[PDB]
């Protein structure tokens, strides 16, 4: 079978600036193992092809995973903007695949705060679709250059979510999987 359990029920998930991608190649895939599950917050397949999907064949499947706030999961989708879709994770407009996401307050909040999950807050430009930026070069907001020293106009580009179990559902951590379907000229392996 295709190792979709290794991505969906992993104990740890990546920060969104460092979003993880796992490749699914040469394997038989049980899609029913997901599309018969529960308390998933959202399971929209933007891939106008797959609306609920089915048992299709794909040259490869790719799973992209990360943790974002609750308010920001809107962005994990065609044509949106904001800190998450501009600076962290951006899908193309020609997207065929699904955006699976669930509330993980149970796993990713800590009494007094989990601060291990981060996002990029400053960036000189917007990401291209499926592009990743894990650099930590100080961001120059003004015109005086920074020279490795943080201060006015010289901001460390990443910020942490302050994930606490108390705050509203919109500020709570959610895990997100993004399945994308590759259709190349080659044996359909899934």
């Amino acid at each position, epitope marked *: 079978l295709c190792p979709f359990g290794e991505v969906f029920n992993a104990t740890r998930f990546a920060s969104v600036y460092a979003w993880n991608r796992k490749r699914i190649s040469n394997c038989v895939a049980d899609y029913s193992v997901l599309y018969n599950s529960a308390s998933f917050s959202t399971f929209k397949c933007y891939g106008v092809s797959p609306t609920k999907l089915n048992d299709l064949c794909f040259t490869n499947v790719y799973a992209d995973s990360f943790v974002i706030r609750g308010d920001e999961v809107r962005q994990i989708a065609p044509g949106q903007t904001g800190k998450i879709a501009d600076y962290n994770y951006k899908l193309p407009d020609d997207f065929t695949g699904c955006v699976i996401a669930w509330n993980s307050n149970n796993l990713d909040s800590k009494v007094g705060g989990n601060y291990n999950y981060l996002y990029r807050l400053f960036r000189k430009s917007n990401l291209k679709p499926f592009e990743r930026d894990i650099s930590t070069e100080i961001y120059q*907001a*003004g015109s005086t250059p920074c020279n490795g020293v*943080e*201060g*006015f*106009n010289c*901001y*460390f580009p990443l910020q942490s979510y302050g994930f606490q179990p108390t705050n509203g559902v919109g500020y709570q951590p959610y895990r997100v999987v993004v399945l994308s379907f590759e259709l190349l000229h080659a044996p359909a392996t899934v």
Partner: nanobody
Amino acid sequence: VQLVESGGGFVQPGGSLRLSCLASGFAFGDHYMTWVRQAPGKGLEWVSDINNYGDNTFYSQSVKFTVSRDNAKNTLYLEMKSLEPEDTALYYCARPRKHFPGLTEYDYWGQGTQVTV
């Protein structure tokens, strides 16, 4: 064309303080204003913003703290209560250049006032 913080000193855990920032040289009404924090050898930490008139105030995860503005007296205030020791840093008054609250490009700021709880 400047900004001078004032207030602060040494106070005890659970004490208080009211910092002031006398602006000068510009139309204090036409701008948002900011408080940021800098512990020694660290980056800027954003504390609060306030809008032109004073009815929208945005704070960080430190409500312990209230921002006020008297655009007649060109003064920006920050009343700090229920201080912790972790609230110790140098406290800056700063004006953004051109509302998503938090750190942005600041075109003017002051010299700082030390708060050590």
